[PDB]
Amino acid sequence: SGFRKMAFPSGKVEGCMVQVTCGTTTLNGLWLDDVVYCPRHVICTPNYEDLLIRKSNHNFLVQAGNVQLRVIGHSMQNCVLKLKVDTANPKTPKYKFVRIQPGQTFSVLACYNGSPSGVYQCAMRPNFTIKGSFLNGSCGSVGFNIDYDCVSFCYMHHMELPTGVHAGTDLEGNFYGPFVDRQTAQAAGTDTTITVNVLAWLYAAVINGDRWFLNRFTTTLNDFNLVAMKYNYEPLTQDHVDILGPLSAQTGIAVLDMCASLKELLQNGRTILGSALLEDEFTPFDVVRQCSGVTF
Amino acid sequence: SGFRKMAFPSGKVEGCMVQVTCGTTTLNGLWLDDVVYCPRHVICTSEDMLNPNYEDLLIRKSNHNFLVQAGNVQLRVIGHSMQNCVLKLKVDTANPKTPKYKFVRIQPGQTFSVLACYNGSPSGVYQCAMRPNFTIKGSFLNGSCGSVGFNIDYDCVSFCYMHHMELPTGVHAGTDLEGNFYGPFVDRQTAQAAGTDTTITVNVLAWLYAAVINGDRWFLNRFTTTLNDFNLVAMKYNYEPLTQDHVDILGPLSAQTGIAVLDMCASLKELLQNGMNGRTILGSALLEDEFTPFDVVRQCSG
Numbered sequence A: 001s002g003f004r005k006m007a008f009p010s011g012k013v014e015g016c017m018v019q020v021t022c023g024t025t026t027l028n029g030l031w032l033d034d035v036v037y038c039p040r041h042v043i044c045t046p047n048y049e050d051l052l053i054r055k056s057n058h059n060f061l062v063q064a065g066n067v068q069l070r071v072i073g074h075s076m077q078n079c080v081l082k083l084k085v086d087t088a089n090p091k092t093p094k095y096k097f098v099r100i101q102p103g104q105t106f107s108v109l110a111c112y113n114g115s116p117s118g119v120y121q122c123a124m125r126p127n128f129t130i131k132g133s134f135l136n137g138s139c140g141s142v143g144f145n146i147d148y149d150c151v152s153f154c155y156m157h158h159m160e161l162p163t164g165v166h167a168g169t170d171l172e173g174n175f176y177g178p179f180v181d182r183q184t185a186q187a188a189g190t191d192t193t194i195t196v197n198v199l200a201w202l203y204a205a206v207i208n209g210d211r212w213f214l215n216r217f218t219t220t221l222n223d224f225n226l227v228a229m230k231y232n233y234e235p236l237t238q239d240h241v242d243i244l245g246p247l248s249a250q251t252g253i254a255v256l257d258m259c260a261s262l263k264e265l266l267q268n269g270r271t272i273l274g275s276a277l278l279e280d281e282f283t284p285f286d287v288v289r290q291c292s293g294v295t296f
Numbered sequence B: 001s002g003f004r005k006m007a008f009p010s011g012k013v014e015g016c017m018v019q020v021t022c023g024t025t026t027l028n029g030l031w032l033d034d035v036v037y038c039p040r041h042v043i044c045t046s047e048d049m050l051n052p053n054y055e056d057l058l059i060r061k062s063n064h065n066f067l068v069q070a071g072n073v074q075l076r077v078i079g080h081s082m083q084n085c086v087l088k089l090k091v092d093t094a095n096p097k098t099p100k101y102k103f104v105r106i107q108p109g110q111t112f113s114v115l116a117c118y119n120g121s122p123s124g125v126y127q128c129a130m131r132p133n134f135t136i137k138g139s140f141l142n143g144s145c146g147s148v149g150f151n152i153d154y155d156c157v158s159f160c161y162m163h164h165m166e167l168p169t170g171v172h173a174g175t176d177l178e179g180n181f182y183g184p185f186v187d188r189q190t191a192q193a194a195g196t197d198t199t200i201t202v203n204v205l206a207w208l209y210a211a212v213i214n215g216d217r218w219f220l221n222r223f224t225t226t227l228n229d230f231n232l233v234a235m236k237y238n239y240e241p242l243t244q245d246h247v248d249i250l251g252p253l254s255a256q257t258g259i260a261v262l263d264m265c266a267s268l269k270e271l272l273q274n275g276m277n278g279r280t281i282l283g284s285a286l287l288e289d290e291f292t293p294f295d296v297v298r299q300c301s302g
């Protein structure tokens, strides 16, 4: 029993982290095969096309611990810098690049100077920001999930907003949300609660012996959606009902019955899983992987 | 900026996890050098779990009775010895992935990362704290015994915990890497009760300093208190006593924010009497006690 904010085992990702230095700027790089992916803002003192044409291969100092890697080429893809290196990473795992949807979670391996400092779970907020923990030097730190034995890289850290939340790109350099890689005052849209994730966390509470919030009532998907609007909650789709199915069968509580419990919880407000708020940073798959004991 | 429940990168520990099987029992083992450390209850029979005689069961075991697997590589056991509640299995090959490591025994209130494993393979990593009643609030299912707790300063892995059992309340109990249980727990399937748990006061105060560092000031007040008056309050709320030693360790955080410890104590006293009134501190609607003053410094400074 027990329910914690559990990250993925970061072992496969640590073997990919390298230090990238350009001028007086030092950040992190993701070494996969013979390419090092890192935020392009490492070339700033901005016109990225201009600054990149004025760079040579040896202008980029890449370090894998104490081993200096020789840059044999460089190219830009959106907001990511791709540095071709002479040696392929022997610790390159089975990996792929994915772009996650708002509401999806991932583990962040925070790094400084190419070395991993810590690991934590994060959710891609519906306003396309992450509520992470990043200090100066953590750009290039990545977000990932693990399915079977494949690392799915979904996030690269680029910036912090004046509000304290963070923003970054997928591994193709495409920013999540309306953010740009300029050191300018940027504002995130009004954030909303990930409804399907709160429902999955309520199923995790039933699995761990918390039933006080349950009620006899059931609802329709349309009535529950009218309620979600009045509370800044993301709409619940029929697709979300299908992904909640396995958790609904394991507890014997229909999704629309748990929706009537969530409606009641939102109108009145005890603790659930040691929290005094409705937690939205656990997907239905996060609940299954923790409560079923999925390994990697 | 930002404040999260941050675990240590588990890479160095994943390379040490092996699967240990004894009879019909399968659990996790920690492979360091040519020794595999695991909970000794792996030698218990499904029938006699209440009062096993470990010295008696270990004398009737041979090296070939222990099946150790490192992924797909079966390791040959060349010897076996018992140290308190841990079983140490001498193996023929030294772990090539053995990191720089040491064994430490933590004090209640201290935090650490838990690499949860099943069948020798890592499932997940979370942050934990040694509760004042000597239990941990882990997330563990059957087959998780042998999973370890660790801290990684510089490049050395401090192994401080090995998972052994779950108590009827859903909390967990285990040993240090010398096999000494934390608390009054024994490795038997006998009726065991953890004492009434209490809140780690110094950790809540450190987390309040982390909130000021991250721009949360709503809970602050002009009042100050004495250490003795605050301690009378802590009792009325099931909080552990705040000692002068705790004031000293909180010093660096107090100097970085300019808020005296006894002033933050008057804010905690106020927070305990009213609550949150709908407000949140660092995204939590409760007073968090699982961050030591050193965890706050690690995360906020680097």
Ligand SMILES: *C(=N)[C@@H]1C[C@@]2(CN1C(=O)[C@H](CC(C)C)N(C)C(=O)c1cc3c(F)cc(F)c(F)c3[nH]1)C(=O)Nc1ccccc12
Pocket: A026, A027, A041, A134, A135, A136, A137, A138, A139, A140, A158, A159, A160, A161, A162, A163, A166, A180, A181, A182, A183, A184, B001
């Ligand atoms: C990456 N190495 C660091 C880590 C940091 C963001 N970051 C950057 O390099 C950012 C690059 C820009 C996208 C060009 N960066 C400097 C910012 O995001 C940034 C700078 C400021 C301010 F000066 C003021 C401000 F109000 C603001 F919102 C800013 N954002 C990160 O994740 N956290 C952090 C803290 C301190 C310095 C750097 C970074």
Ligand SMILES: *C(=N)[C@@H]1C[C@@]2(CN1C(=O)[C@H](CC(C)C)N(C)C(=O)c1cc3c(F)cc(F)c(F)c3[nH]1)C(=O)Nc1ccccc12
Pocket: A001, B026, B027, B041, B049, B140, B141, B142, B143, B144, B145, B146, B164, B165, B166, B167, B168, B169, B172, B186, B187, B188, B189
């Ligand atoms: C380790 N492989 C598993 C994981 C589990 C505890 N655990 C054990 O093997 C424990 C060994 C004892 C110390 C001999 N174990 C069986 C328990 O701690 C245990 C068994 C029971 C009960 F039958 C009833 C009960 F009320 C109780 F509190 C028990 N504790 C773990 O951490 N969580 C878990 C869940 C289910 C099975 C095993 C384990």
